């Protein structure tokens, strides 16, 4: 076989699909947004998670077309159900580094925003802190244009990589996402308490929103809310779900 060929074939057959993981307010309430996560519905193997295929997709140069197809599918999925979403509903996408050197991301974003009434949603792009994006005049231009569209920038897996304050102002960062490994250590390791608290400290100093990822227990939720964490995500809040389950739950919240 050829795994590159097989990714191309999967893309042509629309086998990459969105799952939706909800975000809720630190102090509780109805969902204020979703993170969109790629799944591969494989004809044989079933539903495959992205750690099994995204790195190959990056090596092969296919991640950008796969991301575009996801964003288009989200527009067709949630575009006609805006009234189920309270205003300011966040929709987040993980963006690969190569996509951030490409001015076509601006068009991908404008197209997704065009599928909802104006200002109804807030589109969030998540860039992992692990690979820190090298700046150029192209990235300066791209991020100015995204900002002017109303797109927000979140730095994902925060606390695991090595970014600086100066880099946070460069790319106009709106939000830090606390890596789930730090959240897993709450009520256990003392070191990570100081790390977590230092992430919270930085977000206050810079006036940034903060999402904790990986909130699995009530003890985690309560520790994080006592520290002002804006938004919570994790299995306690809701596992990544297909559209049908997302719509179900949004109808209940009303
Ligand atoms: N580039 C990229 N990464 C994704 C996408 N969906 C999920 N990931 C990443 O894959 C990893 C595993 O996610 P889960 O198995 O849903 C996470 O770090 C997540 O951010 C996507 O559409 N694009
Ligand atoms: N074990 C575990 N994984 C989670 C939890 N919440 C989200 N995930 C997974 O973490 C990944 C999201 O990571 P990113 O922050 O890198 O997008 C997805 O694969 C998602 O399914 C959680 O509470 N526990
Ligand atoms: Mn993410
Ligand atoms: Na990520």
Residue numbers in the entry: 5 to 258
Q: What wording appears in the published article?
A:
DGC domains containing the signature GGDEF motif synthesise c-di-GMP from two GTP molecules while EAL1516 and HD-GYP171819 domain-containing PDEs are responsible for the hydrolysis of c-di-GMP to 5′-phosphoguanylyl-(3′-5′)-guanosine (pGpG). Hydrolysis of c-di-GMP by EAL domains has been shown to require the presence of divalent ions, either Mg2+ or Mn2+, with the most efficient reactions occurring at alkaline pH2933. Here we report as yet structurally uncharacterised EAL domains from the core genome of Pseudomonas aeruginosa, PA1727 (MucR) and PA3825.
We were fortuitous to observe PA3825EAL with bound product pGpG, from co-crystallisation with c-di-GMP and Mn2+. In this complex, the M1 site in the pGpG-bound structure is superimposable to the M1 metal in Mg2+ and Ca2+ complexes, the M2 site is vacant, but we observed a solvent binding site that interacts directly with the bound pGpG that presents metal like coordination geometry. We propose this as a potential third metal binding site, designated as M3. Diffraction data collected above the manganese absorption edge confirmed the presence of Mn2+ in the M1 position in the pGpG/Mn2+ PA3825EAL complex but showed no signal for manganese at the M3 metal like centre. Consistent with the absence of any anomalous signal in the M3 site, we have placed and refined sodium in this location which is abundant in the crystallisation condition and consistent with the geometry observed. The M3 metal site displays a tetrahedral coordination sphere consisting of Asp 160, a water molecule, the ribose O2′ oxygen and a P1 hydroxyl oxygen from pGpG. In PA3825EAL, the M2 site is empty, but Glu217 (contributed by the β7-α7 loop in close vicinity to the β5-α5 loop) replaces interactions with the phosphate moiety normally made by M2. While PA3825EAL lacks a metal in the M2 site and possesses one in the M3 site, the comparison with CC3396EAL, in which all three metal sites are occupied, suggests M3 site is a bona fide metal binding site in PA3825EAL. Instead, the M3 metal is observed in the product state where it is ideally poised to stabilise the negatively charged transition state during hydrolysis of c-di-GMP to pGpG; where pGpG directly contributes to formation of the M3 metal site via its non-bridging phosphate oxygen (terminal phosphate group of pGpG). The data presented also allows the identification of a third metal site M3 which is a hallmark of the product state.
